[PDB]
Amino acid sequence: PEPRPALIAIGSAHLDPKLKAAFQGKKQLQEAIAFMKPGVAIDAITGTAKKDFLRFEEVVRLGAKLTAEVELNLPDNLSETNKKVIAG
RNA sequence: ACUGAAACUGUAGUAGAACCAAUCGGGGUCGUCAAUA
């Protein structure tokens, strides 16, 4: 069989459009949405940090509400039972 | 003379080891102060 495409299209989840507008040109604020989380690996016998295993990771603050547009291009003939299966 | 489809930038990883909030100090003891007549 030929490969089926998806019935669901799912956009990228972006920050609220008005919040995004508030940020424009405020480079310092865009950086402040995220922060360094430290990361280190400990040696199991010495209980001390391994060599090499020290990392700093950008993480984005919790509380972000993002929304993505979704499209369900369901077939024209699909039954109401099968619609409710997809929704389920 | 016809939009390729489908695919999580994810997986493993202790911001930790070492470091004395500490060193010295009798709750003690005597003559000063003012300037003239």
Kindly describe this structure.
It is classed as rna binding protein/rna. The entry lists the keywords CRISPR-Cas, complex, RNA, crRNA, RNA binding protein. The entry is titled "CRISPR-Cas type III-D effector complex bound to a target RNA". The protein: Cas7-Cas5-Cas11. Organism: Synechocystis sp. PCC 6803. The protein is an alpha+beta fold and 88 residues long. The protein is 24% helix and 35% strand. It is built from 3 helices and 6 strands; from the N terminus they run ββααββββα. The protein has helices at 17-23, 27-32, 80-87, and strands at 8-10, 14-15, 34-42, 49-60, 66-67, 70-72. A two-stranded antiparallel ribbon has the order 1-6. A hairpin with a 6-residue loop joins β3 and β4 (49-60). It binds one RNA strand of 37 nucleotides through residues 2-6, 37-43, 46-50, 53-56.
Strand order of the largest sheet: 1-6
Helix content: 10-25%
SS content category: alpha+beta
Number of strands: 6
User: Rough shape?
Assistant: flat
* Rg, nearest Å: 23 Å
Supply the number of helical segments: 3
Describe the biggest sheet? Answer: 2 strands, antiparallel
Distance between the termini: 26 Å
Order of helices and strands: EEHHEEEEH
Q: Strand content of the residues, in percent? A: 35-45%
Protein name: CRISPR type III-associated protein domain-containing protein
Organism: Synechocystis sp. (strain ATCC 27184 / PCC 6803 / Kazusa)
PDB class: rna binding protein/rna
Keywords: CRISPR, crRNA, RNA BINDING PROTEIN-RNA complex
